[PDB]
Amino acid sequence: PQITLWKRPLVTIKIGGQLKEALLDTGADDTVLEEMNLPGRWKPKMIGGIGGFIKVRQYDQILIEICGHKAIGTVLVGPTPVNIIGRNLLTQIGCTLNF
Amino acid sequence: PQITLWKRPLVTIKIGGQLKEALLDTGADDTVLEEMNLPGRWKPKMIGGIGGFIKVRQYDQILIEICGHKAIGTVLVGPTPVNIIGRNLLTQIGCTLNF
Numbered sequence: 001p002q003i004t005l006w007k008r009p010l011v012t013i014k015i016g017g018q019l020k021e022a023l024l025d026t027g028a029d030d031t032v033l034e035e036m037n038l039p040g041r042w043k044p045k046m047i048g049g050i051g052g053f054i055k056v057r058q059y060d061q062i063l064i065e066i067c068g069h070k071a072i073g074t075v076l077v078g079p080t081p082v083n084i085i086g087r088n089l090l091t092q093i094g095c096t097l098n099f
Numbered sequence: 100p101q102i103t104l105w106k107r108p109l110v111t112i113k114i115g116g117q118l119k120e121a122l123l124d125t126g127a128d129d130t131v132l133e134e135m136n137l138p139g140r141w142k143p144k145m146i147g148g149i150g151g152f153i154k155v156r157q158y159d160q161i162l163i164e165i166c167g168h169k170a171i172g173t174v175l176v177g178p179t180p181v182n183i184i185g186r187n188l189l190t191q192i193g194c195t196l197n198f
């Protein structure tokens with residue numbers, strides 16, 4: 001679809017069999033989700049935001065559905081204030097900015 | 100134009116008479132710019148994201164040109180690692196997400 005930006009671009013995502021709300025975040029290189037339980041193995045990693053760096057759990061090759069569009073990529077899980085869908089997954093669903 | 104998301108959506112902007120590079124960020128409600136000594140009245144504010152908060156100065160009715168599209172609105176100035184064009188200005192330049 002075409003999404004205007006007078007409101008937050010929030011979408012329902014499907015991950016690990018559970019639905020969640022997440023923000024389509026073109027300023028995020030990576031996808032970062034709030035604390036949750038995901039199956040499979042993970043490795044500790046660091047990510048930086050506007051306020052500094054946080055420790056996260058990196059799950060690779062995770063199946064995630066975004067507005068019915070399927071993606072398989074890295075998902076970082078940690079103390080983010082907001083579930084954000086970053087460019088690593090926005091590219092998989094064919095997302096672009098237009099003006 | 101159409102901006103794909105393989106790389107960071109960086110564009111050239113003009114603010115306070117200076118050219119800068121900034122991120123077109125659908126994940127940001129408002130616009131945050133690197134420290135700069137803008138004239139006029141401002142008020143202090145704290146803004147938060149991954150890693151915590153930073154202190155910024157809020158200027159209102161600031162003119163920014165974004166790839167030739169003029170816009171005027173609120174701008175936060177402080178020690179952000181990158182210039183961030185948020186939805187408050189993205190709407191004004193007719194920017195949409197499309198997939």
Ligand SMILES: CC(C)CN(C[C@@H](O)[C@H](Cc1ccccc1)NC(=O)O[C@H]1CO[C@H]2OCC[C@H]21)S(=O)(=O)c1ccc([C@@H](C)O)cc1
Binds near residue numbers: 023086129
């Ligand atoms: C909800 C999101 C978290 C909000 N944020 C915008 C995101 O798009 C940030 C933008 C950004 C890009 C690069 C360095 C630091 C911050 N991206 C980001 O955290 O992504 C991380 C994951 O992927 C990696 O790549 C990038 C950095 C890593 S915010 O910046 O915290 C922000 C907070 C308050 C306001 C008020 C004024 O409205 C405006 C903006």
